[PDB]
Every structure is written in structure tokens, then in C-alpha cells.
Design a protein around this nucleic acid. Structure first.
Ligand code: MG
Ligand code: MG
Ligand code: MG
Ligand code: MG
Ligand code: MG
Ligand code: MG
Ligand code: MG
Ligand code: MG
Ligand code: MG
Ligand code: MG
Ligand code: MG
Ligand code: MG
Ligand code: MG
Ligand code: MG
Ligand code: MG
Ligand code: MG
Ligand code: MG
Ligand code: MG
Ligand code: MG
Ligand code: MG
Ligand code: MG
Ligand code: MG
Ligand code: MG
Ligand code: MG
Ligand code: MG
Ligand code: MG
Ligand code: MG
Ligand code: MG
Ligand code: MG
Ligand code: MG
Ligand code: MG
Ligand code: ZN
Lengths: 122, 69, 185, 60, 66
RNA sequence: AGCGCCGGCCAACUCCGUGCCAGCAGCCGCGGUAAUACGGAGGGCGCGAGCGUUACCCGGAUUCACUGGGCGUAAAGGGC
RNA sequence: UGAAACUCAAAGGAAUUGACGGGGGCCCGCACAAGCGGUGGAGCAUGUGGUUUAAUUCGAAGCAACGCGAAGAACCUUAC
């Protein structure tokens, strides 16, 4: 494009679309669950991953993932959510952090405990 | 019978620091472990989970009349 | 053909549409003490999906809880993952040849769509009835004509059809009326 | 029944019709030649091995 | 409930329906699991929690020792 | 003295359990009875009173290109 | 004139080597043709499918599994 053109129109700047609307500018957001569920993924993976629809304090109600083995989450459970998607679970844009509020850590984690809210063993 | 007795005392040991309401104490006279509890449902899930997560070669009675004098 | 056999045919024809209503009303998460609400559900028995009424025994002892008495403990895990199936949002316990499902007090978000569901199944039943009745008058239009029958006769055959039709309507109205009060209760 | 049946074949039985040749290097109950006592497989194994005297590849 | 060694405390309504509350010793509380089905056509329920201690009558006292 | 990692990017390896399950995953992708990828252990790499995570800004993005991009067939010559 | 939410880990450009073609060209093989005797149909022999059965042992599956592993199952062989 001519130097003249660039003076007239100008190099259009690129916009960064946020990847987490429900978070609403926060690092974390509290919420309460509406469904306890297990959803099969798309190809070529087959399982039943623990997913919990959560209605947040931001007014939002999205689909949240429950990482690790064994959850205690149920309806009316209060939980904290962070970011994080799942490449093979469409719709799930957020992770539920273990060890916060009514969400309790995995039992008998040894490796990588701080990610799953498991205290140090005795 | 017989050599898997030490997994029983180690099975409910994983539940002593996880559920501190019921007790596990052997009987002096007659001599046997009695798994205390709070109710039928309390001592149905302990019986179920051990039989299906911890194998436990075991089978129980059991009433619950647990009298005191 | 004739009259008595047309009425029996009608009362028979309308019954099937009525029972179909009752089927549609149980299989809803009603007061949720119902057993047959969980009786039909897609499972996974040996790769193939099939209704669990050839797999287990649903029985509703107490109203607040419910048991899905099974006879195949490798199917209970196929059922358990099939109860944890998108819908009811319930947390069942399992094994010890047992499978308990307690029912929370129906929320006003679900109570909202429950009544709405009942009346919907209600109207469609009636439309099933009324559409049969018109089938019956056409059975009567030919049958009176075919048989060279009287006029004041073919009038009462209509009213006698209405009598019959207001039968299956009042019951249908009463079915979905009760099933509601169990949801409002 | 492999090791118990080749040992059965060493023991002379109760009646002589039950006499069956068993291979003397692998243990086949079929295709066993009385001239070699082996079998058609252990014939070909040893034919190419030459340890069968005279037995050579035929080609006419 | 009384032939189950029961001492009634009162009744109140709930789901209309109605709730009844009493004191029953645990020993006579086994058949009651499925007995509420035999009576209420499967429409009743219960909960049951422990409470306290007392002194069983000498009819069952002097016969438990065997 | 704790935390993260130890399939490739990217530094750091074996054993057992599991059997397209349970779960990991930032991308490509792992698990269908020999899993350096899942959980544990032994072992190793990296940091240290801190270590990992999420959120956002810039960088790598020469991918809005003034420095410093293009437009025959890849996105793009305006019908004339 | 002309968005987005949402969603995908690619959508593409040319070219290379294969394979395929109800594409072409120049060929060969009892491939068709030209011939001659057969099978399918009949009765039996022999092998499988199925069912049967206390068992009717297992394998072999278009060609390239079916008078095959068996070039000798009354017992033995024989695994049921
Ligand atoms: Mg310590
Ligand atoms: Mg008149
Ligand atoms: Mg051998
Ligand atoms: Mg022998
Ligand atoms: Mg041979
Ligand atoms: Mg690291
Ligand atoms: Mg590496
Ligand atoms: Mg390396
Ligand atoms: Mg190595
Ligand atoms: Mg292990
Ligand atoms: Mg990890
Ligand atoms: Mg791939
Ligand atoms: Mg392994
Ligand atoms: Mg890794
Ligand atoms: Mg590992
Ligand atoms: Mg960036
Ligand atoms: Mg750089
Ligand atoms: Mg740089
Ligand atoms: Mg730039
Ligand atoms: Mg580039
Ligand atoms: Mg420029
Ligand atoms: Mg460019
Ligand atoms: Mg173009
Ligand atoms: Mg124009
Ligand atoms: Mg090309
Ligand atoms: Mg080419
Ligand atoms: Mg060609
Ligand atoms: Mg033939
Ligand atoms: Mg066979
Ligand atoms: Mg095979
Ligand atoms: Mg050939
Ligand atoms: Zn041989």
C-alpha cells in the first residue's frame, strides 16, 4: 500500500479477543453448581469426564471441569473456578480448583499436590 | 483365612484419619475385631467399600445390640 | 361393524391413548418418588443399548429415596454411568448389590417446568382422544349410510359418541390434575 | 497331552492294536515314517541337514 | 409403633401427610425398615437417631442373660 | 525444606498398577494387557523460603510490515 | 455496504512418488474366443456351514478355507 494510502487509512491494529468472558476481568470467580454430570468427549477419545455446570457470582452460568480423581461436588455446592479449556470437551472453558470452599482435594495425592489441593502427608 | 488379616487392620486405618466417628477395637474375651459405627448405612458403606475397593477376605454377621453394663 | 362394536372399538381406541398418557406422566421426574420415571433409560448392556426393564427392578420404598434393584453388578456400573447421564443431576450410591438414589426437594426452576410438562402431555392426550372421535364419526358416516339407518338414530349415535368422548376427557383431565398435585406437593 | 502321550508311546500297552508310531525328535502322531522313525518335518529338517545318509533332494 | 416398645411424643403435619415422633429402643427397630412399606403401601418414611439410656423391664432383663 | 517437571518443544528414566477405564493435556496428542505421556514408587532435572497456577500488558508476531508484508493459481485488482 | 457470538488444528497453494480410473496407447497369460469333456440336476464317497449333542475337539474364511493340517479317527491315535 502506498505511503500516501497508509497516511489516509493507516495500518489497522489487531484486537485481542478475551478467551474467558465469564471471568469478567478477575483471576478467580466464586460460584455455585447446578448440575453434576459426566460427559463423553469427541473423537478419538472415549471416557466420562467429570463436568459441573456452575452459575457464577458474575451472573454467568458456564460449564466447569472437575480435575483429578474423585469429587464431592453436588447441587448447591459452593466452588471457585479458574481458567482452562479442554481440547476434547466442547463448551468447557474453565477449571474448578481443588481444595477451595465445598470443593475438597483429591485423597492420597503424592505427586503434584498443590495443583490438586492435597496437604503434605504425615 | 488368613494371611490377609494385616490388610484389614490397614484398610480401616485409611478410614481412621479420614472418618473419626466410628471405632475399631478387638474384643478381650471371645477375641475378635468389632468395627463400631453409627448406623446400618454407616456400617454398610464400610462393609461395601472394603469388599469392592480393598478386597478384604472377610464376611461378617452381624447384629448391633452393643449393650453396656 | 354396527353400533355396539363401534363403541367398543371406540372405547378401546381411546383407552390406548389414555394409558399412553399415564406412561408419559410417570416417566417424568414428578414428586420423584415414582419408580417408573427411572424405569426407562438408555444404558449400555454388553455394548448394545437396551431398556433396563430387561435388566433391573425399580422399586420405590420410601418416597424421598428410591432403589433401582438390579440383578447384574457389571450392569449396575453400566447403569450408574447411565444415570449420571446429563439429565436428572442426581448423586447415586452403588454396589453391595445396591444402588440408592435420594431425591432433593424439587427446586422452583424444575418445579416450573414440571407442571408445564404435565399440562403439555395433558393436552396432547386430549388431542389424541378428539382426533379418534372424528375418526369414529367418519366410521359412523359410512356405517349409517352403508346400512340405511334412521335419521334420529344417527343423531343419537353422535350424542352417544360425545358421551363416550366426554368419558375419556374427564379421566385425562383427572390424571394430569393429580400428577400435578404430587408435583405441587 | 504332549509329554504324557510320547511317554505313553514308549510303554508297550495292553493290546497290540494300540501301537502307534511317535516321532523320535519332536513328537508327532501323524506323518511318522517307520523307515526313519521321525516325521515328514524332521525328515526335511535333517534331509537338508544331510544327516540323513544318502537322502538328497530329488529333481527329475 | 407402641407394640415396638414405643413411647409417643406427638404428631405434626408436613407434606399433608403428617409426621409422628416417638422414642423406640433400637432392639425393636429391625423389621421397621420394611414394615413402613407393609402399612403405608410404600408411602411413609422415617430417619431414626440415637438418644439416651434407660433400664429395660425385668421381663427382658432377666431373660437376656443366656 | 519445600515446590514444579522429568513423551517432543524442553533438562531430566526405570519399575509396578491400570487396559480408549480411571485420568493427563499449553500445542501436536497420550490410555484398546510390556504407557519414559495416566496414579504411586525408586531414580533424575530445575529453582529455593519460596515454588507452581489462573487473569492481563509486550515480546517472539516480518501475523497491520515507517523501519519491515503482500494481491496470476495460496487470503487479496475495483465488471469497465 | 457487510459484523459478531460460536466453532475448528486446519482450510490452502504448487509439485513429487505411488495407487486407481465405467482415461488413452503397445503388449501377454486356456482370459475370452475357437474347440472338447465335465460339474450344478441323480445315487453314493469325502471335507465345511448349521443345528443337534453329556461331547459331536481345535484350527483353516473369497481367490490363496471346503479328498485342507489327517500320506490310513473301531480301541490307540485324542486334544472333547
Ligand atoms: Mg510430617
Ligand atoms: Mg322428533
Ligand atoms: Mg510341549
Ligand atoms: Mg507319561
Ligand atoms: Mg504328511
Ligand atoms: Mg519446571
Ligand atoms: Mg525430555
Ligand atoms: Mg531431553
Ligand atoms: Mg532404556
Ligand atoms: Mg501399585
Ligand atoms: Mg503431570
Ligand atoms: Mg493427529
Ligand atoms: Mg505397564
Ligand atoms: Mg510429560
Ligand atoms: Mg509418571
Ligand atoms: Mg501474546
Ligand atoms: Mg526470541
Ligand atoms: Mg528477542
Ligand atoms: Mg508486530
Ligand atoms: Mg509468518
Ligand atoms: Mg511497507
Ligand atoms: Mg504476507
Ligand atoms: Mg483468490
Ligand atoms: Mg460495481
Ligand atoms: Mg501434480
Ligand atoms: Mg503426477
Ligand atoms: Mg491402464
Ligand atoms: Mg460336486
Ligand atoms: Mg470348528
Ligand atoms: Mg482363530
Ligand atoms: Mg494356483
Ligand atoms: Zn518330527
Amino acid at each position: 500500500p502506498t505511503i500516501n494510502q497508509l497516511v489516509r487509512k493507516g495500518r489497522e491494529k489487531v484486537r485481542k479477543k478475551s478467551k474467558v468472558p465469564a471471568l469478567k476481568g478477575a483471576p478467580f470467580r466464586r460460584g455455585v453448581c447446578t448440575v453434576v454430570r459426566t460427559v463423553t468427549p469427541k473423537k478419538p477419545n472415549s471416557a466420562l469426564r467429570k463436568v459441573a455446570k456452575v452459575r457464577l457470582t458474575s451472573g454467568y452460568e458456564v460449564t466447569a471441569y472437575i480435575p483429578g480423581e474423585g469429587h464431592n461436588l453436588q447441587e448447591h455446592s459452593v466452588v471457585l473456578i479458574r481458567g482452562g479449556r479442554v481440547k476434547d470437551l466442547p463448551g468447557v472453558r474453565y477449571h474448578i480448583v481443588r481444595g477451595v470452599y465445598d470443593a475438597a482435594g483429591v485423597k492420597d495425592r503424592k505427586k503434584s499436590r498443590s495443583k490438586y489441593g492435597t496437604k503434605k502427608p504425615k | 483365612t488368613k494371611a490377609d488379616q494385616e490388610k484389614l487392620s490397614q484398610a480401616l486405618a485409611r478410614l481412621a484419619e479420614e472418618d473419626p466417628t466410628f471405632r475399631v477395637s478387638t474384643h478381650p474375651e471371645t477375641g475378635q475385631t468389632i468395627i463400631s459405627g453409627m448406623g446400618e448405612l454407616h456400617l454398610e458403606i464400610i462393609v461395601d467399600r472394603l469388599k469392592r475397593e480393598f478386597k478384604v477376605d472377610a464376611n461378617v454377621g452381624k447384629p448391633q445390640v452393643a449393650y453396656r453394663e | 361393524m354396527t353400533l355396539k362394536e363401534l363403541y367398543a372399538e371406540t372405547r378401546s381406541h381411546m383407552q390406548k391413548s389414555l394409558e399412553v398418557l399415564e406412561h408419559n406422566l410417570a416417566g417424568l421426574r414428578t414428586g420423584r418418588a415414582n419408580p417408573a420415571l427411572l424405569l426407562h433409560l438408555k444404558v449400555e448392556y454388553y455394548g448394545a443399548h437396551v431398556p433396563l426393564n430387561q435388566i433391573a427392578t425399580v422399586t420405590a420404598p420410601d418416597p424421598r429415596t428410591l432403589v433401582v434393584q438390579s440383578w447384574d453388578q457389571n450392569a449396575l456400573k453400566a447403569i450408574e454411568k447411565a444415570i449420571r447421564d446429563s439429565d436428572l443431576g442426581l448423586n447415586p450410591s452403588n454396589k453391595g448389590d445396591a444402588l440408592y438414589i435420594n431425591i432433593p426437594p424439587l427446586t422452583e426452576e424444575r418445579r416450573k417446568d414440571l407442571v408445564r410438562a404435565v399440562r403439555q402431555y395433558a393436552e396432547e392426550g386430549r388431542v389424541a382422544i378428539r382426533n379418534i372421535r372424528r375418526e369414529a364419526l367418519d366410521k359412523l358416516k359410512k356405517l349409517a349410510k352403508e346400512l340405511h339407518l334412521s335419521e334420529d338414530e344417527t343423531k343419537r349415535a353422535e350424542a352417544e359418541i360425545q358421551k363416550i368422548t366426554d368419558e375419556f376427557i374427564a379421566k385425562a383431565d383427572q390424571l394430569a390434575e393429580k400428577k400435578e398435585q404430587e408435583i405441587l406437593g | 497331552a504332549r509329554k504324557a502321550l510320547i511317554e505313553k508311546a514308549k510303554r508297550t500297552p495292553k493290546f497290540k492294536v494300540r501301537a502307534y508310531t511317535r516321532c523320535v525328535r519332536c513328537g508327532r502322531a501323524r506323518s511318522v515314517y517307520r523307515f526313519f522313525g521321525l516325521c515328514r518335518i524332521c525328515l526335511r529338517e535333517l534331509a537338508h541337514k544331510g544327516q540323513l545318509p544318502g537322502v538328497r533332494k530329488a529333481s527329475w | 409403633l407402641n407394640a415396638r416398645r414405643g413411647q409417643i411424643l406427638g404428631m405434626e403435619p408436613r407434606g399433608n401427610a403428617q409426621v409422628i415422633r416417638a422414642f423406640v429402643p433400637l432392639a425393636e427397630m429391625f423389621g421397621y425398615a420394611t414394615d413402613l412399606r407393609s402399612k403405608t403401601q410404600g408411602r411413609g418414611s422415617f430417619v431414626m437417631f440415637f438418644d439416651h439410656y434407660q433400664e429395660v423391664p425385668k421381663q427382658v432383663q432377666e431373660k437376656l442373660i443366656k
